[PDB]
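Box S1 | Example of a co-folding query
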Amino acid sequence: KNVPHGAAHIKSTFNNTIVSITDPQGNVIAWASSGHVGFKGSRKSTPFAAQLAAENAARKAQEHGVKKVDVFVKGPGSGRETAIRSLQAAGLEVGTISDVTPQPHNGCRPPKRRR
RNA sequence: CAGCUUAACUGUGGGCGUGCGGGCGAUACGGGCAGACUAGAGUACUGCAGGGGAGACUGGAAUUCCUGGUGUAGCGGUGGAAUG
Ligand SMILES: [Mg+2]
Ligand SMILES: [Mg+2]
Ligand SMILES: [Mg+2]
Ligand SMILES: [Mg+2]
Ligand SMILES: [Mg+2]
Ligand SMILES: [Mg+2]
Ligand SMILES: [Mg+2]
Ligand SMILES: [Mg+2]
Ligand SMILES: [Mg+2]
Ligand SMILES: [Mg+2]
Ligand SMILES: [Mg+2]
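Box S1 (continued) | Returned holo structure for magnesium ion
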């Protein structure tokens, strides 16, 4: 089909980073990830896979005909700016930037400290 | 001091003998007794800040889960990987 506007969702952890593009109504057009790009071990952790998923989702969404996108990012830093710049260079221009990160107001208890 | 020749020893009466008694005469501090005062203490008049304590009521973000859409091959993980 086609869509004149949508939002690309970004959630990036230390060891992963996925990208999914959704319309405002909540129906997803397409998604991409480093794992699908084919990176295992620490390879996937790179922002490089971030830009790869970036232009991948760009292609698989612009096939459906996405024009305007607003990206939301979350999670700890793994290349957020790198991925957004790669997407911008991919040919899609964002109208507004927004970060909504899961920040629980001291709900539940995090797992023990690493050792 | 006194003599056994000096010798241990004792011949010698004083002196020593740290505790306990009543009678004569003290009152400074150290108790009880005695009435009064307040520099401690305590309440009394008005203000104060506070996650002090107990019960109940209530909001938010989030994890997880159930249900339902969009949606595609992996998601997740560590120095890496498989159990998942
Ligand atoms: Mg990792
Ligand atoms: Mg863990
Ligand atoms: Mg003599
Ligand atoms: Mg004598
Ligand atoms: Mg004695
Ligand atoms: Mg007394
Ligand atoms: Mg008086
Ligand atoms: Mg007083
Ligand atoms: Mg107060
Ligand atoms: Mg109680
Ligand atoms: Mg569902």
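Helices of chain A lie at 34-37, 47-62, 80-89. The longest helix of chain A spans residues 47-62.
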